[PDB]
Design a protein around this nucleic acid. Structure first.
Ligand SMILES: Nc1ccn([C@H]2C[C@H](O)[C@@H](COP(=O)(O)OP(=O)(O)OP(=O)(O)O)O2)c(=O)n1
Ligand SMILES: Nc1ccn([C@H]2C[C@H](O)[C@@H](COP(=O)(O)OP(=O)(O)OP(=O)(O)O)O2)c(=O)n1
Ligand SMILES: [Ca+2]
Ligand SMILES: [Ca+2]
Ligand SMILES: [Cl-]
Ligand SMILES: [Cl-]
Ligand SMILES: [Cl-]
Ligand code: NA
Ligand code: NA
Ligand code: NA
Ligand code: NA
Ligand code: NA
Ligand code: NA
Ligand code: NA
Length: 326
DNA sequence: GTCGG
DNA sequence: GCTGATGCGC
DNA sequence: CCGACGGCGCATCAGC
């Protein structure tokens, strides 16, 4: 891609700051700069040119100049050659191991897949599952399989109650040729912002997907969010499909449009849209868009009956889901 | 790390 | 138990 | 030690 060298560098720095430095705002600064650079329609030829872009400052511009002159960044050379940093960064790739747990593990001499396997008594249930499917969760899901997964999920939900509507969101809804995992937005008319007229609405669906052996493991589960593992059925004599991560989110039916906007992403698109909302005097979450008062306190929810309405409130031109990718 | 009050 | 902070995650 | 930065679900832990 255009400016791929630079956006790769900034992404690597982003991940180091989050995972090793435990500096989430530096992580976000790097992600923002990488994002604005990725959409820039010219080849960047200096740090100064890049510095004109919002989110690129003095330090990123200096790194861009080094990268453009030399094809590398000395800072990143050093990080890659640091065994500890590399191990910490590696461990965070396991589902359930974050920057804090990774550092603790590495501090105790645990720094490889083999070490985790020999020390499973030190891992919680989530981490054990993350470890068990480590290779599988590293793989992406071809759209072809995402379609079969969709077919399975929508068929089973219908069986439970025809009044449920399930919508596959994330990268899939943005039209990606492959996805990292499956995200299902769920609504039912019994659950709205005014009342929860039936109990166990999410549970019912999870239970049915477990009954048909689609959902194979549970990482976390509450009244509105499920996080687990699933697998397509495979044929005789053939290699199994990898196990896949699945997220299911039950959203109030009357807040569908804020919900689907959130769950379609991308993550950086959402943060950027919410940032723009804030400078326009609104706050957006997965439920509502609200105006801000003088105290910074949000007011009552604004009327919404399309994704576009949310864009209209903040004076953004509508972006189709496919144009919300990085 | 960047931006803005 | 609670509230609030922290750590995991979307 | 200029301080915000997007916003929140679920799980766990500290200090009641
Ligand atoms: N920090 C984040 C992470 C995610 N999301 C939202 C937007 C994402 O699109 C959606 C699903 O999250 P995923 O991590 O599954 O991301 P994607 O589906 O976008 O990408 P992938 O193809 O890696 O699954 O949740 C968000 O608002 N903020
Ligand atoms: N854009 C900036 C830059 C710095 N600061 C912070 C950091 C400083 O410690 C503090 C006040 O610093 P000074 O008292 O030095 O500010 P002055 O305006 O007096 O600096 P100068 O003497 O250069 O005019 O404000 C800030 O809020 N916004
Ligand atoms: Ca996804
Ligand atoms: Ca997901
Ligand atoms: Cl930070
Ligand atoms: Cl767990
Ligand atoms: Cl709300
Ligand atoms: Na800039
Ligand atoms: Na992880
Ligand atoms: Na179908
Ligand atoms: Na199996
Ligand atoms: Na409208
Ligand atoms: Na409109
Ligand atoms: Na949190």
């Amino acid at each position: 891609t255009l400016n791929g060298g630079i956006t790769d560098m900034l992404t690597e720095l982003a991940n180091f700051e989050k995972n090793v430095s435990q500096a989430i705002h530096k992580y976000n600064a790097y992600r923002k700069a990488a994002s604005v650079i990725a959409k820039y329609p010219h080849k960047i030829k200096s740090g100064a040119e890049a510095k004109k872009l919002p989110g690129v400052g003095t330090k990123i511009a200096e790194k861009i100049d080094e990268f453009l002159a030399t094809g590398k960044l000395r800072k990143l050379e050093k990080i890659r050659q640091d065994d500890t940093s590399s191990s910490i960064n590696f461990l965070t790739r396991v589902s359930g191991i974050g920057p804090s747990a990774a550092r603790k593990f590495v501090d105790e001499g645990i720094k490889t897949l083999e070490d985790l396997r020999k020390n499973e008594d030190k891992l919680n249930h989530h981490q054990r599952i993350g470890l068990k499917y480590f290779g599988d969760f590293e793989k992406r899901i071809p759209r072809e399989e995402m379609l079969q997964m969709q077919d399975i999920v929508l068929n089973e939900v219908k069986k439970v109650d025809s009044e449920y509507i399930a919508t596959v969101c994330g990268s899939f809804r943005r039209g990606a040729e492959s996805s990292g995992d499956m995200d299902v937005l769920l609504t039912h008319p019994s659950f709205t912002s005014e009342s929860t007229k039936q109990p166990k609405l999410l549970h019912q669906v999870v239970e049915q997907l477990q009954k048909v052996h689609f959902i194979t493991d549970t990482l976390s589960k509450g009244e509105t969010k499920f996080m687990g593992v699933c697998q397509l059925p495979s044929k005789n004599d053939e290699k199994e499909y990898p196990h896949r991560r699945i997220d299911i989110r039950l959203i109030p039916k009357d807040q569908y449009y804020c919900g689907v906007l959130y769950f379609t992403g991308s993550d950086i698109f959402n943060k950027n849209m919410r940032a723009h909302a804030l400078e326009k005097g609104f706050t957006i979450n997965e439920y509502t868009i609200r105006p801000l008062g003088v105290t910074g306190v949000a007011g009552e929810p604004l009327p919404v009956d399309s994704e576009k309405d949310i864009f209209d409130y903040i004076q953004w031109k509508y972006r189709e889901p496919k144009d919300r990718s990085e």
